[PDB]
Ligand binder design. Sequence first.
Ligand SMILES: Nc1nc2c(ncn2[C@@H]2O[C@H](COP(=O)(O)OP(=O)(O)OP(=O)(O)O)[C@@H](O)[C@H]2O)c(=O)[nH]1
Lengths: 74, 176
Amino acid sequence: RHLHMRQKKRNGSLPDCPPPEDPAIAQLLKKLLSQGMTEEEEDKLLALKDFMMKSNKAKANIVDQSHLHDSSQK
Amino acid sequence: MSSMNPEYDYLFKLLLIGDSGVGKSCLLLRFADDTYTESYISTIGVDFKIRTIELDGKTIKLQIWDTAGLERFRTITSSYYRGAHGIIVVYDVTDQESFNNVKQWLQEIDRYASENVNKLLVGNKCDLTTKKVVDYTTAKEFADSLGIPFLETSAKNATNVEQSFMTMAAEIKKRM
Ligand SMILES: Nc1nc2c(ncn2[C@@H]2O[C@H](COP(=O)(O)OP(=O)(O)OP(=O)(O)O)[C@@H](O)[C@H]2O)c(=O)[nH]1
């Protein structure tokens, strides 16, 4: 959501953009940008939005099953 | 009572462990020989250097051991930990995998080292700020979560290198 709003500011579709509201988002934004996140990678990340969201939700759902196999991971 | 060498009161065997390329040999060389070099020779088995230091007026002899970090020269059971007074776990602050494997190095300590051996997490290569991946807060949270002291360092620039080993020597004296 924050990145999508930054896209609107980047493409001239919004006047200006405030910093994220929850510090965990600013901490992540800081991490991403300080690691060399180019503006084109922000656009590409936003195109992968649906994939990353669905996939992250599915990865979490497997972690919700990792309690059933906690003994075999050792 | 026991015999006591006139030159040194305490013999503290230190040991360096961690993934390959984290800078264990560089840290050992920078501390015991004030030398650094870009030439990488993958350590095999064991190496050690002795450095004599002084803390709280006590002459402390440190025997610092550098173990091979590569997969091929490692084994499930290890007998280098046996008799170590303190163990430094090094990781490369520019490689998250070396930091992640710290969890796995710790369980080796709890299995083969002395039951209450001193531990110290060291984050070498702190000079590569443009390439660093772990946050100092990420490491501190993890080190404090286990109560192990921690010091980010750089064998290249001597940054905190001396202090890292001196801190463990002090911690061992504190333990005994
Ligand atoms: N920039 C930077 N590079 C370092 C530093 N320390 C080590 N290196 C680099 O990493 C390479 C390997 O360092 P080593 O100390 O041999 O790594 P190691 O932990 O001993 O690896 P093994 O001997 O295989 O266990 C060195 O040749 C340097 O190029 C450091 O403090 N800063």
